[PDB]
Amino acid sequence: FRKMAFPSGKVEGCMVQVTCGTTTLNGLWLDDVVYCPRHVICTSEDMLNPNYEDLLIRKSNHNFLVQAGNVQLRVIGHSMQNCVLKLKVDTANPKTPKYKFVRIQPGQTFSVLACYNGSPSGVYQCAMRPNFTIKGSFLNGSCGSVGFNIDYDCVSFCYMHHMELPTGVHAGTDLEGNFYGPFVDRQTAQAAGTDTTITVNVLAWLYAAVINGDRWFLNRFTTTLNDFNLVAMKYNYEPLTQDHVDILGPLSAQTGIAVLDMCASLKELLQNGMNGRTILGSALLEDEFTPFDVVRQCS
Ligand SMILES: [Se]
Numbered sequence: 001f002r003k004m005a006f007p008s009g010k011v012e013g014c015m016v017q018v019t020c021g022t023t024t025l026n027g028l029w030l031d032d033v034v035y036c037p038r039h040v041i042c043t044s045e046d047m048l049n050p051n052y053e054d055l056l057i058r059k060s061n062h063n064f065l066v067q068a069g070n071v072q073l074r075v076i077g078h079s080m081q082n083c084v085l086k087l088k089v090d091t092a093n094p095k096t097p098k099y100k101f102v103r104i105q106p107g108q109t110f111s112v113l114a115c116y117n118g119s120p121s122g123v124y125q126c127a128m129r130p131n132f133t134i135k136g137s138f139l140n141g142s143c144g145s146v147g148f149n150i151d152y153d154c155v156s157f158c159y160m161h162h163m164e165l166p167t168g169v170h171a172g173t174d175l176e177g178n179f180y181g182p183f184v185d186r187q188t189a190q191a192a193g194t195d196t197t198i199t200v201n202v203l204a205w206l207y208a209a210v211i212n213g214d215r216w217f218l219n220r221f222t223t224t225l226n227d228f229n230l231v232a233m234k235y236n237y238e239p240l241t242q243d244h245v246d247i248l249g250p251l252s253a254q255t256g257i258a259v260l261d262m263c264a265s266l267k268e269l270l271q272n273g274m275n276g277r278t279i280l281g282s283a284l285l286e287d288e289f290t291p292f293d294v295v296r297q298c299s
Pocket of ligand 1: 025162
């Protein structure tokens with residue numbers, strides 16, 4: 001059972017290179033617009049305390065070098081929407097897939113196409129942490145790389161990487177420019193806040209374990225919603241709601257294990273630990289699979 005990412009072909013054809021002054025980072029070319037973080041207009045000194053409205057006025061259309069492989073694009077319009085730049089260009093992307101812009105919720109997963117100077121380099125799956133950060137691989141020059149999900153033929157763009165926090169974690173915005181969490185595109189100290197474990201995801205992962213043979217953790221006990229939630233706060237687990245119990249419905253039915261019985265296995269898991277053994281080959285509880293991810297990787 002593997003963390004597995006969406007096929008990235010439809011996003012690769014959207015990845016361009018955007019250079020303004022000395023700063024160069026990645027952009028997203030959909031239709032006749034290129035989307036990129038607004039701090040492409042920042043020098044390394046500007047990042048300490050930028051006035052973006054002021055800094056953008058120093059710039060005109062010809063100051064922006066948008067490159068899609070070997071082709072330059074003529075920039076014929078520029079606009080700042082929150083923390084993203086919108087570079088109106090003359091040529092519409094012939095490879096523009098069917099796409100939406102969505103703002104996802106904490107605990108939901110997505111794929112990330114890591115790019116460096118407009119060229120894709122890797123793809124990986126991750127989750128939006130409850131504190132609105134993501135833990136990933138964003139080396140120098142990965143700014144502008146996007147996160148997405150793919151339904152059928154539609155690419156739901158949900159994430160654009162802007163900053164690596166001083167604590168090593170990453171933060172960014174939706175495609176409208178609004179940061180997830182309380183983060184600002186400024187090189188200052190920013191608190192991420194207490195992270196928690198996505199409890200609905202861990203339960204979904206345990207359901208994947210039962211379906212794939214691993215069942216040692218299945219317990220005789222059961223428990224109540226309130227009793228389990230009391231054990232959740234202690235171990236920094238998201239509180240389990242009835243919505244979360246409903247979403248785990250199809251999984252509970254295919255394995256014939258009630259959600260509350262699975263919560264009791266998790267309870268003894270939280271209170272006793274792995275105690276040496278593994279689940280699906282992992283020595284710790286995995287919370288980066290949503291119930292939708294598990295069902296997609298089963299039947
Ligand atoms: Se950046």
